[PDB]
Design a protein around this nucleic acid. Structure first.
Ligand SMILES: [K+]
Ligand SMILES: [K+]
Ligand SMILES: [K+]
Ligand SMILES: [K+]
Ligand SMILES: [K+]
Ligand SMILES: [K+]
Ligand SMILES: [K+]
Ligand SMILES: [K+]
Ligand SMILES: [K+]
Ligand SMILES: [K+]
Ligand SMILES: [K+]
Ligand SMILES: [Mg+2]
Ligand SMILES: [Mg+2]
Ligand SMILES: [Mg+2]
Length: 1319
RNA sequence: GGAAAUUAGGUGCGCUUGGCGUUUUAGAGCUAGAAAUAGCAAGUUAAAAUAAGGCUAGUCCGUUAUCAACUUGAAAAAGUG
DNA sequence: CAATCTCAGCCAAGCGCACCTAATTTCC
DNA sequence: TGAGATTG
């Protein structure tokens, strides 16, 4: 008889076997191999450790980048093939010189000047066109016939770096304010605005923040304020999104943004409230928006050139030239000694490091700003620097905002200019434009032909896909439909039927009637509440749901029960405040098609389901239009135009066949039929499909993956999922260890941004319109501090008092839990706030008091509408106005502290239970031979603290194994003592439940001082009340637990793993002579071209062979560890002997080759162990088994800050000698297996310096000292403020004559190989 | 233990795109001097590569998951204390 | 050799589906 | 945290 405890973590599976006396057995296991040792004794406790499992995300991002480099290359190849025949007439090696431009002169086949093949023409080109943008602008604007090579380069530059696809439709740069002002002045005839003299271009296109230009513009309009109507508008032409609630005395918030696709509908929503007369106001706002949309990137008047982007780059270049000339002149006059540093030293962040070295524009500015402020005549240079507009390059990090339409306009213009001289440019103009503009639709995916596991695209024609034949060769419709249909759920009830669109009319009718049919009403004179009849539900749907998007309970009472039923008073149950379900799509389509009778006519149901399906399935408006054309004769062209813009996303949970297809045989009614009208029973969906007197249940019944696949397909981090599969393998091994007898119980416990924080605070303060970021700028790395993050999330105010907080006094402020942490175990931002003093929350018993909620609710709602708090956080803050925390709330919170509710942990329980329990009884009921028990970590955590079995994670890895053991002990004892708990813990009144779960663990204790101010005593022996069988003996089972935790032999196994992933570090380093550099392409010698460093070793191999020595090349026998790199691995595995001989080995002992992945384990002298870090470095291989008295002493001494504390304090003082004893434990261990005497000397030295320090601080820093002794990779650590750097073991030679240890997953089965016998 | 709806927040898998960076080459450096060097001039741009590569030859695929040893099997797998 | 110093690809956009958690109404 | 290079 035995049980298994398991502790499942992100990097470990702890495990232990226990008997019915809570003991861990030990056993002799066979030892295989070639050593002296035939067997060894092992305790049945241990922990498997592993590197974290990784998600597929990084791999996915690299796969996308590969496709985009492939396709970018093909864009150029398309362009060159078009130019091929005519370029051969001008210069038959021009494309060859382009392709070999990277090669050193000695390697080149053609002359080294790429464009023209000779130095005088090449020099003349750069003199006339210092940047590509000079050429582009020249070719756009000039009427001269141009050299075909210069045409090619300009078009290639645009196609290769073609700009983004975030703006739909066409752009035509044309560089209105007088009219809009005159418009507003007319539409508000009594309150006009005078805009005479206002330079609207200079104010709005200023480089400043949009929030600032609003101020500047309004400053020029006396009588207008920034929050006035015209002020709120200026942001619309600008690009912000403000709310016009107070402008029009509105009741609901209504904002608008021109670039959003919802603009025409929100403007329609707003105009319906404010009146059609306001059409010309937002219309003139939209007209002005066109000419100044691209003013951020186009800084040139579009009347003097058709290439304002290139002209803007040229303006960068010219100002750079002018300002560089000035900067050099000023420096020569005032600071000459700095000239050499600024303009020659590439290692400094001056101009030299900016141009030739590695200084970014940001690092260059910071370096040169104090030099500018120090000198005279640099006022204009300083303004440009602060505008981030000084000595600018033209290829820069901020060019991501250029839309492809801008590059397209210059491309089109060059083609128009030069097609007059080259007929092939006229015949291929649209082809070339297609190369720039064509984008593979994301709903089509990779253009594969049977060899891509990622692709779903299908072809209308079996031929090669180009940008010009894409629409004709690819079946866009089938591919877009496949895109969605491969992913969407089927109806679990009818598993061959796809779920309906979430926005289907039928689906929403289903939702509305399912909710409505369970409403009840009662009025004075009714004996009892009544369901609504079919006729009343139809009246409510027709009168309320089909006239209002949302239906409140007040409208139900006033507009139905008063108006129709003639009730003055009525009590409603089944719905609170408002119905959750609504007919959103009905009202959407009513606005569009303006034909209520059409919507209400049942004969149109198929048409309208197909329309919404098309609007849900497809995202492309032209594909939607194409698919809607069967219905074109039904609607006006104007309606059709609005319908194709009405997109929906999202899928329901149920199919059309289920909700309104299958019929009950006796009645002939569908499910929706019953929801509309079901006598006086009003059965809802759950009742209908479970009712044995209907045929829905049997028809749903008639309509109705390996382990690794199953685990992989679970929701939850790939990290925790790695531990789950290892857990199953640990259990399988332990069962085999136990003679294939199954355990009685298996007890399982499963363990429980900087950029994102800045984005939430930026987006949230922009929503509030607050200037807190301007007053108190922050860096994303700072927002990792809890109190500073809360400060900005609360707009610098107290959450419980209507007052600002002082940002420089956060150490005096409190972080309080909204729901007190004594009830719920939430320490996240969603349950914490920053307040001056937590006493102002109200009482500590509950949620923040009612008075606080009354005062702060409106301020809390503004944070909620800014997403600075979540809805969950708001509901907990305002809970007091809904009764606060009730008695059931408290019981549930204490229950949830005990009973695991996570689905992922239930999945682990289910997996183990279905692997252990496989037999059925006489009633075909499952036979539960093994009870799978799930515990939360708090149970064992409190057990450890209550009975002084303390845990110090930094000492070694044993705490994972000790956890699993205590899980087994506490879990089996718990259900032995209270077998009724099995419903709660085994897979397969309010105050009383509160008191019960608060005291369920009392039976372990002898004397319990209850919270009720009383003390209770229990006997030495705890028993089950029904059976009398002994469960716990406080005179022997606690000592047994001590004998378990103090055992030094714990099977800790670091999972050996082949390394995978990137070939090497990614940086391309410049050329050097060191043979370390790796070629980036087959024929790119790193001595000429640079290359990569640091290949990653996939695994090492032991090689016993011979190598050639000296000029004589005489053969010498060697035994070596060879690191096989990731890049080499396929070639090595394809033919190991041929690979090894190419490396220089001869007469390899083929049968002696040993594959040695990372963490391969070796034992040397005196028990010292090492693991392979690679082929050239080792890791520490031992665990320091510190005695239990020292572990408990460290815990108590390090946590020095009931009246048992005085007893714990006295114990620390009486055992002050343990500190030196622990240092001697570390020293002996380190001298035996660590062998880092310089670091150890530095540690003993540092420990002697601080013997005068308080005991708590010494014990605190002693815990750090175990980094020297820990298993695994060496790592630096600190003792007080003396830093000990790491000692790496950068030689593997010694393991070549050591003992190699192959371990099974538990480490219980070993094969030991004495490598000294090899050679 | 489940289901539908509402509200909100997370996570995973997949697709399509934009901008940098880096590397080598091209962008005639000048004057003095035998040279070492010194005094100046100049600088903003481009091509090409962006896992080596692969066969299945596609505008495809190439970094996730999974892995002690031994044995009988090329392989999948199965067995061994 | 050792001890010590040094280094590490990054920033951004849009879209689809599927899960999970946590509160509310109604049910099985 | 493996490993390239420089300093001792
Ligand atoms: K040559
Ligand atoms: K004003
Ligand atoms: K550089
Ligand atoms: K630079
Ligand atoms: K560049
Ligand atoms: K409601
Ligand atoms: K859609
Ligand atoms: K029509
Ligand atoms: K892997
Ligand atoms: K990895
Ligand atoms: K292993
Ligand atoms: Mg790119
Ligand atoms: Mg390639
Ligand atoms: Mg570049």
């Amino acid at each position: 008889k035995y049980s298994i405890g398991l502790a499942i973590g992100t990097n470990s599976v702890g495990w232990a076997v226990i008997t019915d006396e809570y003991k861990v057995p030990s056993k002799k296991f066979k030892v295989l191999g070639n050593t002296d040792r035939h067997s060894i004794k092992k305790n049945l406790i241990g922990a498997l450790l592993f590197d974290s499992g990784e998600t597929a995300e990084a791999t996915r991002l690299k796969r996308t980048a590969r496709r985009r480099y492939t396709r970018r290359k093909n864009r150029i190849l398309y362009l060159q093939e078009i130019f091929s025949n005519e370029m051969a007439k001008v210069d038959d090696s021009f494309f060859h010189r382009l392709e070999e431009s990277f090669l050193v002169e000695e390697d080149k086949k053609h002359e080294r000047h790429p464009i023209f093949g000779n130095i005088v023409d090449e020099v003349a080109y750069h003199e006339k066109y210092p940047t590509i943008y000079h050429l582009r602008k020249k070719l756009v604007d000039s009427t001269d016939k141009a050299d075909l090579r210069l045409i090619y380069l300009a078009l290639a530059h645009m196609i290769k770096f073609r700009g983004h696809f975030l703006i739909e439709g066409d752009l035509n740069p044309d560089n209105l304010f007088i009219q809009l002002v005159q418009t507003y002045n007319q539409l508000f005839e009594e309150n006009p605005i005078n805009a005479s003299g206002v330079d609207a271009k200079a104010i709005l296109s200023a480089r400043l923040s949009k929030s600032r230009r609003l101020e500047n513009l309004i400053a020029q309009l006396p009588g207008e304020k920034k929050n006035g109507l015209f002020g709120n508008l200026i942001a619309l032409s600008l690009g912000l999104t403000p709310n016009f609630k107070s402008n029009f005395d509105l009741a609901e918030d209504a904002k608008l943004q021109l670039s959003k696709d919802t603009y025409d509908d929100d403007l329609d929503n707003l105009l319906a409230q404010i009146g059609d007369q306001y059409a010309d106001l937002f219309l003139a706002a939209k007209n002005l928006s066109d000419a100044i949309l691209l003013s951020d990137i186009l800084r040139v008047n579009t009347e003097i050139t058709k290439a304002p982007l290139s002209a803007s780059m040229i303006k960068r270049y010219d100002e750079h030239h002018q300002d560089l000339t000035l900067l050099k002149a000023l420096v020569r006059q005032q600071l000459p000694e700095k000239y050499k540093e600024i303009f020659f030293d590439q290692s400094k962040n001056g101009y030299a490091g900016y141009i030739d070295g590695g200084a970014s524009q940001e690092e260059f500015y910071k370096f040169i700003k104090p030099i500018l402020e120090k000198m005279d005549g640099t006022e204009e240079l300083l303004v440009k620097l602060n505008r981030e507009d000084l000595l600018r390059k033209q290829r820069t990090f901020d060019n991501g905002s250029i839309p492809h339409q801008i590059h397209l306009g210059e491309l089109h213009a060059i083609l128009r200019r030069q097609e007059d001289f080259y007929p092939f440019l006229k015949d291929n103009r649209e082809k070339i434009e297609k190369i720039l503009t064509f984008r593979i639709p994301y709903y089509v995916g990779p253009l594969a032909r049977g060899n891509s596991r990622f692709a779903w695209m299908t072809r209308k024609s079996e031929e090669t896909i180009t940008p010009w034949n894409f629409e004709e060769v690819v079946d866009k419709g089938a591919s877009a439909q496949s895109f969605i249909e491969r992913m969407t759920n089927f109806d679990k009830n009818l598993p061959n039927e796809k779920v309906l669109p979430k926005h289907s009319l039928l689906y929403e009718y289903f939702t509305v009637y399912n909710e409505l049919t369970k409403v009840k009403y009662v009025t004075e004179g009714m004996r009892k509440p009544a369901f609504l009849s079919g006729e009343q539900k139809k009246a409510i749907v027709d009168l309320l749901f089909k006239t209002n998007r949302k239906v409140t309970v007040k409208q139900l009472k006033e507009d139905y029960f008063k108006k129709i039923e003639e009730f003055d008073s009525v009590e409603i149950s089944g719905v609170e405040d408002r119905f959750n379900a609504s007919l959103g799509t009905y009202h959407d389509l009513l606005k569009i098609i303006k034909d209520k009778d059409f919507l209400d006519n049942e004969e149109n149901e198929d048409i309208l389901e197909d329309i919404v399906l098309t609007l849900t399935l497809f995202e492309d408006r032209e594909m939607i239009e194409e698919r809607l054309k069967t219905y074109a004769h039904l609607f006006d062209d104007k309606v059709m135009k609005q319908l194709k813009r009405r997109r929906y996303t999202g899928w329901g949970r149920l199919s059309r066949k289920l909700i309104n297809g299958i019929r009950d045989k006796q009645s002939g009614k569908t499910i929706l039929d019953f929801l509309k009208s079901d006598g006086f029973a009003n059965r809802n969906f759950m009742q209908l499909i479970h009712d044995d007197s209907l045929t829905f249940k049997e028809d749903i019944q008639k309509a109705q993956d390996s382990l690794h696949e199953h685990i992989a397909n679970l929701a939850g981090s790939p990290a925790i999922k790695k531990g789950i599969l290892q857990t199953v393998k640990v259990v399988d091994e332990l069962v085999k260890v136990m003679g294939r007898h199954k355990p009685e119980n298996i007890v399982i416990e499963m363990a429980r941004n900087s950029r994102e924080r800045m984005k939430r605070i930026e987006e949230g303060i922009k929503e509030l319109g607050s200037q807190i970021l301007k007053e108190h700028p922050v860096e994303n790395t700072q927002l990792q501090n809890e109190k500073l993050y809360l400060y900005y999330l609360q707009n610098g105010r107290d959450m419980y008092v209507d007052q600002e907080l002082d940002i420089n006094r956060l150490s005096d402020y409190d972080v309080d839990a909204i729901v007190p942490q004594s009830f719920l175990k939430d320490d996240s931002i969603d349950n914490k706030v920053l307040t001056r003093s937590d006493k102002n929350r109200g009482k500590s018993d509950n949620v923040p008091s009612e008075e606080v909620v009354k005062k702060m609710k409106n301020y809390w709602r503004q944070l909620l509408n800014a997403k600075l708090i979540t809805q969950r956080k708001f509901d907990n803050l305002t809970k007091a106005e809904r009764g606060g925390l009730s008695e059931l709330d408290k019981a549930g919170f204490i229950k949830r502290q005990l009973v695991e509710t996570r689905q992922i942990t239930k999945h682990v329980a289910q997996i183990l239970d279905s692997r252990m329990n496989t037999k059925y009884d006489e009633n075909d009921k499952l036979i539960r031979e093994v009870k799978v028990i799930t515990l939360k970590s708090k149970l064992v955590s409190d057990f450890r603290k209550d009975f002084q079995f303390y845990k110090v994670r930094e000492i070694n890895n044993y705490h994972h194994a000790h956890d699993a053991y205590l899980n087994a002990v506490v879990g089996t004892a718990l259900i032995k003592k209270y077998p009724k708990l099995e419903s709660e813990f085994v897979y397969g009144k309010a105050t009383a439940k509160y008191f019960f779960y608060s005291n369920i663990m009392n039976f372990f204790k002898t004397e319990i001082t209850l919270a009720n101010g009383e003390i209770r005593k229990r006997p030495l022996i705890e028993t089950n009340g029904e059976t009398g069988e002994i469960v716990w003996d406080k005179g022997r089972d606690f000592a047994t637990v001590r004998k378990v935790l103090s055992m030094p032999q714990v099977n800790i196994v670091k999972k050996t793993e082949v390394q995978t992933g990137g070939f090497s570090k990614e940086s391309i380093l410049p050329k050097r002579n060191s043979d370390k550099l790796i070629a980036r392409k087959k024929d790119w010698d790193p001595k000429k071209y640079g290359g990569f460093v640091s290949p990653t070793v996939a695994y090492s191999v032991l090689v016993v062979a011979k190598v050639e020595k000296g000029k004589s090349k005489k053969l010498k026998s060697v035994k070596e560890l060879l690191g096989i790199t990731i890049m080499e691995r396929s070639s090595f595995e394809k033919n190991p002997i041929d690979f090894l001989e190419a490396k220089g080995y001869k007469e390899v002992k083929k049968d002696l080759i040993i594959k040695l992945p990372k963490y391969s384990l070796f034992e040397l002298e005196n028990g010292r162990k090492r693991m392979l870090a690679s082929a050239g470095e080792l890791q520490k291989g031992n665990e320091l088994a510190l005695p239990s008295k020292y572990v408990n002493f460290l815990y108590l001494a390090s946590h020095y800050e009931p009246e048992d504390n005085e007893q714990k304090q006295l114990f620390v003082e009486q055992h002050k000698h343990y500190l030196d004893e622990i240092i001697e434990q570390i020293s002996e261990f380190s001298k035996r297996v660590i062998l880092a005497d310089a670091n150890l000397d530095k540690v003993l030295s540092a420990y002697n310096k601080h013997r005068d320090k308080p005991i708590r601080e010494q014990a605190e820093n002693i815990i750090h000292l175990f980094t020297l002794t820990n298993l695994g990779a060496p790592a630096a650590f600190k003792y007080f403020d003396t830093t000990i750097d790491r000692k790496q073991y950068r030689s593997t030679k010694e393991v070549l004559d050591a003992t190699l240890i192959h371990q099974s997953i538990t480490g219980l089965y070993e094969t030991r190989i004495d490598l000294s016998q090899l050679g």
